[PDB]
Amino acid sequence: YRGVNTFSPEGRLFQVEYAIEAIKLGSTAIGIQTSEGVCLAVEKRITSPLMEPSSIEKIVEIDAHIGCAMSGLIADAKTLIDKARVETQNHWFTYNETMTVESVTQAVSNLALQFGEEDADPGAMSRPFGVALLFGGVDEKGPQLFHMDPSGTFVQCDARAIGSASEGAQSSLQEVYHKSMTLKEAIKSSLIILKQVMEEKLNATNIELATVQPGQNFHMFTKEELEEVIKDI
Amino acid sequence: GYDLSASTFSPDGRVFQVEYAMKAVENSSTAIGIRCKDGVVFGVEKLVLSKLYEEGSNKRLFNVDRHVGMAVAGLLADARSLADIAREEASNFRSNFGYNIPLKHLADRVAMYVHAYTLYSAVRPFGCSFMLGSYSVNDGAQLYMIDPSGVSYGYWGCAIGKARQAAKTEIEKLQMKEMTCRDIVKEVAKIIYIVHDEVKDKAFELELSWVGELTNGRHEIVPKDIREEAEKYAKESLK
Amino acid sequence: RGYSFSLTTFSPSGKLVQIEYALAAVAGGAPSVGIKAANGVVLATEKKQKSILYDERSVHKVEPITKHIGLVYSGMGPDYRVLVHRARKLAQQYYLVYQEPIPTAQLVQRVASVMQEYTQSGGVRPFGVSLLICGWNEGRPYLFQSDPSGAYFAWKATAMGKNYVNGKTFLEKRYNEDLELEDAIHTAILTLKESFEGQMTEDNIEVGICNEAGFRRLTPTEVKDYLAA
Amino acid sequence: RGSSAGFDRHITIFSPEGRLYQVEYAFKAINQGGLTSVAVRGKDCAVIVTQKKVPDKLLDSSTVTHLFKITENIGCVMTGMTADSRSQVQRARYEAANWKYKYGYEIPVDMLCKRIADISQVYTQNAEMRPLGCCMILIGIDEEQGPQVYKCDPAGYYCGFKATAAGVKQTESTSFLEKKVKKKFDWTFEQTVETAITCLSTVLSIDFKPSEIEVGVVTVENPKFRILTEAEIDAHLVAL
Amino acid sequence: TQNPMVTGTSVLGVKFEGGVVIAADMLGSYGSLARFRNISRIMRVNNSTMLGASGDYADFQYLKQVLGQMVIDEELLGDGHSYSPRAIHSWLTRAMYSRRSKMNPLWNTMVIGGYADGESFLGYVDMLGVAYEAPSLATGYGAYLAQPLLREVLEKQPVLSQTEARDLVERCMRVLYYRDARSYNRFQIATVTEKGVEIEGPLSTETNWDIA
Amino acid sequence: SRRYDSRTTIFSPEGRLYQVEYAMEAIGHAGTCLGILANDGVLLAAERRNIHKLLDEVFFSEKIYKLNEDMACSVAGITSDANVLTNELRLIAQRYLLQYQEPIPCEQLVTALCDIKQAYTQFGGKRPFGVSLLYIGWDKHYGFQLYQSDPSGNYGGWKATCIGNNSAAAVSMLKQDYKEGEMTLKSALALAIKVLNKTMDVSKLSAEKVEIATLTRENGKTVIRVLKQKEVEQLIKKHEEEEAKAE
Amino acid sequence: SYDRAITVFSPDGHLFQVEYAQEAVKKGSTAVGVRGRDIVVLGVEKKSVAKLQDERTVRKICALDDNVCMAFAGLTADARIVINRARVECQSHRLTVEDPVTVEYITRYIASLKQRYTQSNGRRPFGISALIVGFDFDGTPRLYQTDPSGTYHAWKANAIGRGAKSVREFLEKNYTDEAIETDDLTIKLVIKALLEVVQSGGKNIELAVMRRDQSLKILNPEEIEKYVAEIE
Amino acid sequence: KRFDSEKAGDREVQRTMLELLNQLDGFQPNTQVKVIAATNRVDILDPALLRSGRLDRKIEFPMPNEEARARIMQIHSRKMNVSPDVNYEELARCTDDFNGAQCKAVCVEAGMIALRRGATELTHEDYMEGILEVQAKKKANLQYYA
Amino acid sequence: NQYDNDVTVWSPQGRIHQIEYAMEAVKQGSATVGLKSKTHAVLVALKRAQSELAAHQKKILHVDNHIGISIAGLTADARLLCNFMRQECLDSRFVFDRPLPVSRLVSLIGSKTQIPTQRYGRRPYGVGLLIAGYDDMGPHIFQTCPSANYFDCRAMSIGARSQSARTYLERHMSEFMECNLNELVKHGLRALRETLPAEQDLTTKNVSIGIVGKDLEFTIYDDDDVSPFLEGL
């Protein structure tokens, strides 16, 4: 009944629609692109005090100039991230250059939706990935922010929010974001919105923030830096 | 739920999936083919779904081999797939045996390929009917038709599509066994115009092809001048 | 490509209904009998054709497997042919390796494993057939039965098919340890006669024997011969 | 009696009584064509006769045929679904050619029927594909057994015969032939053709003309399978 | 083919104003034996392309069957597109190189002449995938004997007429017959122009002076 | 096809493997098999379910299979499935012997088979092996041993256990009257007879419905025996006398 | 090759096969693990000794390597398969990297294996959750937990299996630097937490202790009883 | 259709159907009372009721084509004040897989939309809005399609 | 409701519902137009953005120096088809050193797209294409459907609200053959404008143009590159 590769009356694949629905269960993640750089923020959503917050890695580095923020079924994103890292290093090995953000997003998106049941592979993926990824990095075109959905559709975005509070996080980003915004303003704005949407009180231990700038490589803020920014925020 | 697969017989011994495939073939525009002494002639009622389509778009007449023609009805996508199969069968025959494939053999091979798709649930029956025509001095004119179930027979004049019955009635009065391709072309055009329904469908374009002694045994489109004469004759006949 | 999932699955109470139904088909089949005498074995079956048109000698039910093994069935005819071919194949494979005729017990085990595979493999139904195998190895007669489920038993005398309950009850009353092959053949024919519904003729039944000489199907002359007594 | 449990009526799996409903429907499909065939064995000949219905003049009657030549000395007649019968005919030709190539002598009719029966039996055991809804009858001359007539059905049953029918009126033909077979010999001469044509003409009440039946014969003197021409068929029809 | 069995000798080609002409003798040598003396080694690829070949004749026949089949397939579509001499030359180079790479070469040296879009084409293809286009070509012993004559004339006169090219080819064919031990006196001339491809019958090198 | 698939390797709403649960319920009806571990040996006692005047006596046992020079097993469930697993057990044990030139320890052999069963319950789309087994053997690592396995692929070592019909009553009795660490092969045999006597409510011990095999070490070599009719009857008679003397 | 999609999404974005696998973990016996200053302790409640079972062959605590061990809660057969896969990987990591595995690495390997079975064709999710404890080469104690979904985290102290909510609630209130001050105090914390659910105590709980340099050690029944006596 | 079932209630309607069959054709032929019958389903009708002596002319009523849709909309817009801009051909092309009832709904909804807007005469935009309303299409809260 | 769950299941009316739904997917897509003249073939597409801060999704892709496509439907399927077309064009150039004729490329697409529509467990390609190319036979415009059918057109439009566009193209079809490149593009833009929902105008941010000609390799105009064409409408 209702095979995976099935079309609804409105032409929308059932599995993709359900996978997109699974994204709303993830924690909020925000990414802002500025001429100075790109910043990624994500709520860690600690379940119990006995859990070690250092073990929740919702922001990972693909390469020295690429960073990814995840939301949804975090276990699914592991294979997508591994593919992105491998693709980036293969490109350097072959062309002795650094892959652009769009090309990395394109390679990952192609991997997504390559699921099937009959005449696909001995162990091909049986379902789409239930994760939405935010790719941030700096390339020959400068800072770049890309959003990828379970449907394999990716698009560049100046500022994008994903997760359980995407509706309302995007609303706030609409009012505040502007083209000439600096990296410091972007980090402050991202934290302000995150504090608003988060159910728990925002502190330096329950959020993750990383930035990529033309000069420096992918950088994940430590507690000391996080405490500094939230104090003003 | 006895009609959901081609690998289940109905209680009375019927494969409904095959029957539904024929039903799809019965919604297409009619296409006829008449065998004569000199050769074979094909005709198709191509409806113009939109005025934005180029003349010759979605052509329903194919050359499976340099001496064999092919007319189709029903789902066009399936028809093109079968035409590719027929070309593959014809090409493989020449490489292995070294001479043009007889039309009877080609029809048998394609019919068995079609029949193989009405035995398993892993595939579905081709929803299209088509007819093969050719002419050789040794074998003479030959015309065949194949249905979704995979059945192939020789014909003197065949019809497939919406107005199959009306076309068959018209074909009955031609006496094609002692006529030439030049005269048959006009008759083929006349029949198509009569069966066509101008009230229901907006407009159509007549596609003609033939193979015989006059073409030296090579299937080809009828020349534009001859087609114009046939169309004028058919229109004049429809007084 | 072929279904990869088993069609035989456990029921809530723990029964394999598909194996249960395969036995029902065997039960409704034609009666069969096998008796292990003191110096040989005998297999018999009913071969009642539908009308005079069928050729009685066209197809045999008591088919040899080797020079010393033969078998008969009760169930679907087409499935019997498949198992007979596999049984002959297995017997030759054994001989090629060991340069010795396959012992009756070994052949039964290998044939049983084949039938078991069809109760677990994907996209297949069980063999709706029960086999009786007779043999003579190491100076001793053997009689085995092998059911659709793939289980096999060693019998001194048994019956299968329609009214096999009465056939076994009959055999129990009449059986004796020290019987002779002639008395075994006579009893086997009578067992069939218990539920036959008509006049038994040399063309309406089939018999085969196995002894020190080897397995061989009795000719219609002999079958009529025994019938007369 | 007709209890159902699961998909026993949709695939080839045992019914509660131990039945294969899908196989039974394949038998019921043999009667969709509406035709009947008869095969009778003579003292030194074998004959197969079947109907021939051309629905309209447009059809090329030459191509409409149910008699096929498997090899030089073997011929067959098919009934039931048209497409299914042709596919089985192709397989029989391939199997016969393979036998000749491998073992160095022509394939006996019984062995050819057995091979086709084994192929059919696989269809009723495996659930991926349905059984062919067609029936085959084979006739040939054995080297040391005289004429042979064999028939195989969708289930895989392939018993030999002396007289046989297949199709819409199989029951009536079987009774007619059995009565004739009982009397003296079911014909014991090359005019066994007359017995067959009479049997077919009796059940359907047709009074055939030369262009409504086709006949194929094999004789000990001339073992090659032949299809009698419309002229020869007319000669037999007038004689009877 | 690891070892050729029946082989054809040199093939000549030269392009003139408005066409190309190719020559080759009708002889299949089985290792110093004029075994088959009536085999044509020139093929009409299509309406504007012709092909001569040297080396193993069986491999040439195989390419005849394959190339002939492709042309048939393209004509079946009837879409107004046909293979040009350059396209066929490119296809042959890839086919020959691929076989060489797999270590199962087609033991042949082919000359492709054609005329399309008012431009003449003349190409060369070896068994190892070497290919190029030149005003004149000569495979086998034609490279040593016939090529010097053709090159000398063409350098003097870049553009030739049909009659001049034909006479030049006949002179070269005469020289090859004199000095080539695997040559034959009967040969064919194929010409491609705006009017298509024409193959001339079994011509003979009648002019053979033997003043000894 | 999805429609006809049974989905034999999925989870139930309450996280249960129904096919494994049904298979275990199938074993609950098969003949009773009993295993007792003693100080100087192990034994297996099985209810010979087949009982008919016409059945012949072939092979050395009906439910007790020899796997090695120092191992044996009994089965309860689908007989055909048991034959498949017993053959695999013999192959696994010989493969180990080929690799290491030492007999396979009993625990390793059980684990290897249980791995096969577990795979059937996880992937493949096939029905599980509806069989439960009892193993007895000796090895240089742990001496005499007794193991049990289930269709789920789960196993455990026991000092005395039962599986099959009336397993609950059999284990309840064994638990009460088992003297851990102080049982000889003779008290173990007597305990097996008493347990079988009550577990088989139908009739009493006729010495024909019972098959007993014992494993012992003699002169440094493992010995596996199936008790004959004369000795099995002698045990039953002694049990009858003791039961009489008690009353 | 059976290649049906066992695990698929559902309306509202749920993987019922993963959720069912979780309810299968919940039916299993309780298991507790705490990370001490210089010791990591694993505890587990025994449903019933039965007085006939050989306790040696029913251990729910296993050693993946010399520096890593784990305890599971769920299907016993599934755990045995996962444990074996980890054991071969630990040896493989030793062969290539030439250093002992880290608790995070092996936890990541096990979690990835579980995630793969939730997205593969013709496969059932693993019905177990594991608590992996050990010491990294640096000497820092580690404690990780893995779910059938394929997610994993690092825990100061966590419990899995039946009644895990109450044990976790008890641990949250009773976990402090003072409680884990000494090795004996850490052991008592695990025993007290287990006693929150299990009834008998002492005779119904199994304990395993891992120290920095020493290998895995299983507390004897006498030691467990003594700790229980000291607790009361 | 008549079936051999143990459930009662259906047998009474079967008896009424048999009486109707006899009245339509049977003893005492009738030549002064004609019959017209309408059915949404013909796969369930009894063969004796679909016979050639009772229901001879079985007329099929297909879903309208483009021209039929245009004619239906014109017919039902005859009485309304419609502007001379409406492209009934475009409406027919855009109302694929509709029936006459749905086309009537399109027209009446266009009129009601005009009334809501406060307009004296209808317009092509009103007709398109009515088509959208009659289609009864729901949105999935996102439109990630290109 | 049992005949619309598989692509190998015919319905009683001789229709495959799965194919019908796939055709319905392209309808939900965004509009795009394609027309040809005696010398040029033009593609104009209307891009739309999910959010105001997200870049408009690209709709025109390169295939070869003489072929381009405009997509409308599932982007992931579009990339799979675009990748197949590029490989086919590359293989023709590698083997025959000649551009692949547009019609032969379209025939290959139909053959590939037909296979999924006849096998169990497979699905149709949920994407429609407007192929514009130039070959030895002149400019070409083709239309592809999720059902493996294609039409050689002279002016076609697909996507949401594309019937208003098709109405314009038919009305002015008589002028396309003899118009200049500037005039031809304006015709494509005017049709696309009709599709637009009243209170909205064509902008450099949502209009993308693709042109191929006799002496003009396929080029894509986006952003400010579109301003010259829009100036005048």
mmCIF file with all atom_site columns, C-alpha atoms in Angstrom, chain C residues 8-108:
data_model
loop_
_atom_site.group_PDB
_atom_site.id
_atom_site.type_symbol
_atom_site.label_atom_id
_atom_site.label_alt_id
_atom_site.label_comp_id
_atom_site.label_asym_id
_atom_site.label_entity_id
_atom_site.label_seq_id
_atom_site.pdbx_PDB_ins_code
_atom_site.Cartn_x
_atom_site.Cartn_y
_atom_site.Cartn_z
_atom_site.occupancy
_atom_site.B_iso_or_equiv
_atom_site.pdbx_formal_charge
_atom_site.auth_seq_id
_atom_site.auth_comp_id
_atom_site.auth_asym_id
_atom_site.auth_atom_id
_atom_site.pdbx_PDB_model_num
ATOM 1   C CA . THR C 1 8   ? 3.780   -19.261 4.565   1.00 0.00 ? 8   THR C CA 1
ATOM 2   C CA . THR C 1 9   ? 3.463   -17.438 7.891   1.00 0.00 ? 9   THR C CA 1
ATOM 3   C CA . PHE C 1 10  ? 2.596   -18.445 11.436  1.00 0.00 ? 10  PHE C CA 1
ATOM 4   C CA . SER C 1 11  ? -1.021  -18.034 12.511  1.00 0.00 ? 11  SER C CA 1
ATOM 5   C CA . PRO C 1 12  ? -2.016  -16.559 15.892  1.00 0.00 ? 12  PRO C CA 1
ATOM 6   C CA . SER C 1 13  ? -2.374  -20.025 17.442  1.00 0.00 ? 13  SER C CA 1
ATOM 7   C CA . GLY C 1 14  ? 0.995   -21.130 16.035  1.00 0.00 ? 14  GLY C CA 1
ATOM 8   C CA . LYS C 1 15  ? -0.129  -23.124 12.985  1.00 0.00 ? 15  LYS C CA 1
ATOM 9   C CA . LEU C 1 16  ? 1.179   -22.835 9.424   1.00 0.00 ? 16  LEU C CA 1
ATOM 10  C CA . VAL C 1 17  ? -2.144  -22.756 7.588   1.00 0.00 ? 17  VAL C CA 1
ATOM 11  C CA . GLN C 1 18  ? -0.521  -23.047 4.157   1.00 0.00 ? 18  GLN C CA 1
ATOM 12  C CA . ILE C 1 19  ? 1.100   -26.313 5.225   1.00 0.00 ? 19  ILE C CA 1
ATOM 13  C CA . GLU C 1 20  ? -2.254  -27.349 6.688   1.00 0.00 ? 20  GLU C CA 1
ATOM 14  C CA . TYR C 1 21  ? -3.978  -26.737 3.351   1.00 0.00 ? 21  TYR C CA 1
ATOM 15  C CA . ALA C 1 22  ? -1.249  -28.551 1.411   1.00 0.00 ? 22  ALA C CA 1
ATOM 16  C CA . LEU C 1 23  ? -2.051  -31.611 3.522   1.00 0.00 ? 23  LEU C CA 1
ATOM 17  C CA . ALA C 1 24  ? -5.757  -31.141 2.782   1.00 0.00 ? 24  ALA C CA 1
ATOM 18  C CA . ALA C 1 25  ? -4.956  -31.288 -0.934  1.00 0.00 ? 25  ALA C CA 1
ATOM 19  C CA . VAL C 1 26  ? -2.910  -34.428 -0.287  1.00 0.00 ? 26  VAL C CA 1
ATOM 20  C CA . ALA C 1 27  ? -5.786  -35.882 1.731   1.00 0.00 ? 27  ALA C CA 1
ATOM 21  C CA . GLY C 1 28  ? -8.272  -35.360 -1.095  1.00 0.00 ? 28  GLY C CA 1
ATOM 22  C CA . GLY C 1 29  ? -5.796  -36.947 -3.505  1.00 0.00 ? 29  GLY C CA 1
ATOM 23  C CA . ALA C 1 30  ? -5.881  -40.514 -4.796  1.00 0.00 ? 30  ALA C CA 1
ATOM 24  C CA . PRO C 1 31  ? -5.374  -43.376 -2.311  1.00 0.00 ? 31  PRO C CA 1
ATOM 25  C CA . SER C 1 32  ? -1.913  -44.898 -1.991  1.00 0.00 ? 32  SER C CA 1
ATOM 26  C CA . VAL C 1 33  ? -0.457  -47.776 0.011   1.00 0.00 ? 33  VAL C CA 1
ATOM 27  C CA . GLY C 1 34  ? 2.959   -49.055 1.018   1.00 0.00 ? 34  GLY C CA 1
ATOM 28  C CA . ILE C 1 35  ? 3.811   -52.226 2.955   1.00 0.00 ? 35  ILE C CA 1
ATOM 29  C CA . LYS C 1 36  ? 7.266   -53.304 4.143   1.00 0.00 ? 36  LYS C CA 1
ATOM 30  C CA . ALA C 1 37  ? 7.400   -57.097 3.988   1.00 0.00 ? 37  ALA C CA 1
ATOM 31  C CA . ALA C 1 38  ? 10.082  -59.267 5.565   1.00 0.00 ? 38  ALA C CA 1
ATOM 32  C CA . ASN C 1 39  ? 12.099  -59.478 2.323   1.00 0.00 ? 39  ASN C CA 1
ATOM 33  C CA . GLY C 1 40  ? 10.895  -56.539 0.259   1.00 0.00 ? 40  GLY C CA 1
ATOM 34  C CA . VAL C 1 41  ? 8.600   -53.553 -0.072  1.00 0.00 ? 41  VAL C CA 1
ATOM 35  C CA . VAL C 1 42  ? 5.520   -52.913 -2.201  1.00 0.00 ? 42  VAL C CA 1
ATOM 36  C CA . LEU C 1 43  ? 3.915   -49.665 -3.357  1.00 0.00 ? 43  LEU C CA 1
ATOM 37  C CA . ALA C 1 44  ? 0.438   -49.502 -4.880  1.00 0.00 ? 44  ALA C CA 1
ATOM 38  C CA . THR C 1 45  ? -1.933  -46.777 -6.030  1.00 0.00 ? 45  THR C CA 1
ATOM 39  C CA . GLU C 1 46  ? -5.276  -46.237 -7.723  1.00 0.00 ? 46  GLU C CA 1
ATOM 40  C CA . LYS C 1 47  ? -5.042  -44.971 -11.314 1.00 0.00 ? 47  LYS C CA 1
ATOM 41  C CA . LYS C 1 48  ? -8.728  -44.487 -12.146 1.00 0.00 ? 48  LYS C CA 1
ATOM 42  C CA . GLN C 1 49  ? -8.844  -42.479 -15.359 1.00 0.00 ? 49  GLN C CA 1
ATOM 43  C CA . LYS C 1 50  ? -11.775 -40.196 -16.115 1.00 0.00 ? 50  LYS C CA 1
ATOM 44  C CA . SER C 1 51  ? -12.897 -42.065 -19.249 1.00 0.00 ? 51  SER C CA 1
ATOM 45  C CA . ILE C 1 52  ? -11.896 -44.714 -21.763 1.00 0.00 ? 52  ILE C CA 1
ATOM 46  C CA . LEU C 1 53  ? -10.024 -42.109 -23.821 1.00 0.00 ? 53  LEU C CA 1
ATOM 47  C CA . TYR C 1 54  ? -7.089  -41.630 -21.443 1.00 0.00 ? 54  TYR C CA 1
ATOM 48  C CA . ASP C 1 55  ? -4.082  -43.838 -22.145 1.00 0.00 ? 55  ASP C CA 1
ATOM 49  C CA . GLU C 1 56  ? -3.410  -45.825 -18.976 1.00 0.00 ? 56  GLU C CA 1
ATOM 50  C CA . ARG C 1 57  ? 0.226   -46.502 -19.912 1.00 0.00 ? 57  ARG C CA 1
ATOM 51  C CA . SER C 1 58  ? 0.921   -42.894 -20.945 1.00 0.00 ? 58  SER C CA 1
ATOM 52  C CA . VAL C 1 59  ? 2.081   -41.656 -17.525 1.00 0.00 ? 59  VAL C CA 1
ATOM 53  C CA . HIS C 1 60  ? 3.195   -43.683 -14.514 1.00 0.00 ? 60  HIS C CA 1
ATOM 54  C CA . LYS C 1 61  ? 2.653   -42.978 -10.824 1.00 0.00 ? 61  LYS C CA 1
ATOM 55  C CA . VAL C 1 62  ? 5.193   -45.518 -9.523  1.00 0.00 ? 62  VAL C CA 1
ATOM 56  C CA . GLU C 1 63  ? 8.428   -44.109 -10.947 1.00 0.00 ? 63  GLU C CA 1
ATOM 57  C CA . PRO C 1 64  ? 11.900  -45.493 -10.140 1.00 0.00 ? 64  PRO C CA 1
ATOM 58  C CA . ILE C 1 65  ? 14.645  -43.255 -8.784  1.00 0.00 ? 65  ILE C CA 1
ATOM 59  C CA . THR C 1 66  ? 17.631  -45.624 -8.940  1.00 0.00 ? 66  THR C CA 1
ATOM 60  C CA . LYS C 1 67  ? 18.186  -49.347 -9.406  1.00 0.00 ? 67  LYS C CA 1
ATOM 61  C CA . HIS C 1 68  ? 17.037  -49.896 -5.803  1.00 0.00 ? 68  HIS C CA 1
ATOM 62  C CA . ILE C 1 69  ? 14.671  -46.994 -4.966  1.00 0.00 ? 69  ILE C CA 1
ATOM 63  C CA . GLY C 1 70  ? 11.181  -46.165 -6.177  1.00 0.00 ? 70  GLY C CA 1
ATOM 64  C CA . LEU C 1 71  ? 8.431   -43.881 -4.967  1.00 0.00 ? 71  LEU C CA 1
ATOM 65  C CA . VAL C 1 72  ? 4.715   -43.141 -5.290  1.00 0.00 ? 72  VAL C CA 1
ATOM 66  C CA . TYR C 1 73  ? 2.587   -40.146 -4.328  1.00 0.00 ? 73  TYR C CA 1
ATOM 67  C CA . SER C 1 74  ? -0.867  -38.958 -3.297  1.00 0.00 ? 74  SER C CA 1
ATOM 68  C CA . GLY C 1 75  ? -1.749  -35.415 -4.333  1.00 0.00 ? 75  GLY C CA 1
ATOM 69  C CA . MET C 1 76  ? -1.151  -33.186 -7.352  1.00 0.00 ? 76  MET C CA 1
ATOM 70  C CA . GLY C 1 77  ? 0.392   -34.944 -10.338 1.00 0.00 ? 77  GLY C CA 1
ATOM 71  C CA . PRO C 1 78  ? 2.399   -31.981 -11.665 1.00 0.00 ? 78  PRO C CA 1
ATOM 72  C CA . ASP C 1 79  ? 4.127   -31.457 -8.311  1.00 0.00 ? 79  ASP C CA 1
ATOM 73  C CA . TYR C 1 80  ? 5.061   -35.142 -8.189  1.00 0.00 ? 80  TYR C CA 1
ATOM 74  C CA . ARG C 1 81  ? 6.971   -34.848 -11.467 1.00 0.00 ? 81  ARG C CA 1
ATOM 75  C CA . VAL C 1 82  ? 9.042   -31.962 -10.098 1.00 0.00 ? 82  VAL C CA 1
ATOM 76  C CA . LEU C 1 83  ? 10.034  -33.948 -7.012  1.00 0.00 ? 83  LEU C CA 1
ATOM 77  C CA . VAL C 1 84  ? 10.767  -37.086 -9.040  1.00 0.00 ? 84  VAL C CA 1
ATOM 78  C CA . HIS C 1 85  ? 13.163  -35.116 -11.240 1.00 0.00 ? 85  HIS C CA 1
ATOM 79  C CA . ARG C 1 86  ? 14.854  -33.563 -8.206  1.00 0.00 ? 86  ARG C CA 1
ATOM 80  C CA . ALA C 1 87  ? 15.036  -36.962 -6.504  1.00 0.00 ? 87  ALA C CA 1
ATOM 81  C CA . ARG C 1 88  ? 16.764  -38.516 -9.517  1.00 0.00 ? 88  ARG C CA 1
ATOM 82  C CA . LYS C 1 89  ? 19.139  -35.548 -9.718  1.00 0.00 ? 89  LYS C CA 1
ATOM 83  C CA . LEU C 1 90  ? 20.061  -35.881 -6.041  1.00 0.00 ? 90  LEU C CA 1
ATOM 84  C CA . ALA C 1 91  ? 20.602  -39.635 -6.355  1.00 0.00 ? 91  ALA C CA 1
ATOM 85  C CA . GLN C 1 92  ? 23.068  -39.153 -9.212  1.00 0.00 ? 92  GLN C CA 1
ATOM 86  C CA . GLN C 1 93  ? 24.918  -36.352 -7.415  1.00 0.00 ? 93  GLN C CA 1
ATOM 87  C CA . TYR C 1 94  ? 25.410  -38.693 -4.463  1.00 0.00 ? 94  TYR C CA 1
ATOM 88  C CA . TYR C 1 95  ? 26.624  -41.510 -6.712  1.00 0.00 ? 95  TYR C CA 1
ATOM 89  C CA . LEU C 1 96  ? 29.090  -39.245 -8.517  1.00 0.00 ? 96  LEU C CA 1
ATOM 90  C CA . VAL C 1 97  ? 30.746  -38.301 -5.223  1.00 0.00 ? 97  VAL C CA 1
ATOM 91  C CA . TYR C 1 98  ? 30.638  -41.611 -3.348  1.00 0.00 ? 98  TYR C CA 1
ATOM 92  C CA . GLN C 1 99  ? 30.573  -44.215 -6.163  1.00 0.00 ? 99  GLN C CA 1
ATOM 93  C CA . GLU C 1 100 ? 27.768  -46.022 -4.344  1.00 0.00 ? 100 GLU C CA 1
ATOM 94  C CA . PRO C 1 101 ? 23.963  -45.984 -4.675  1.00 0.00 ? 101 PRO C CA 1
ATOM 95  C CA . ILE C 1 102 ? 22.414  -43.415 -2.358  1.00 0.00 ? 102 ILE C CA 1
ATOM 96  C CA . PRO C 1 103 ? 20.941  -45.132 0.729   1.00 0.00 ? 103 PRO C CA 1
ATOM 97  C CA . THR C 1 104 ? 17.178  -44.838 0.981   1.00 0.00 ? 104 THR C CA 1
ATOM 98  C CA . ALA C 1 105 ? 17.329  -42.835 4.210   1.00 0.00 ? 105 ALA C CA 1
ATOM 99  C CA . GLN C 1 106 ? 19.793  -40.366 2.688   1.00 0.00 ? 106 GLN C CA 1
ATOM 100 C CA . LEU C 1 107 ? 17.654  -39.818 -0.408  1.00 0.00 ? 107 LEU C CA 1
ATOM 101 C CA . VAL C 1 108 ? 14.569  -39.214 1.738   1.00 0.00 ? 108 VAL C CA 1
#
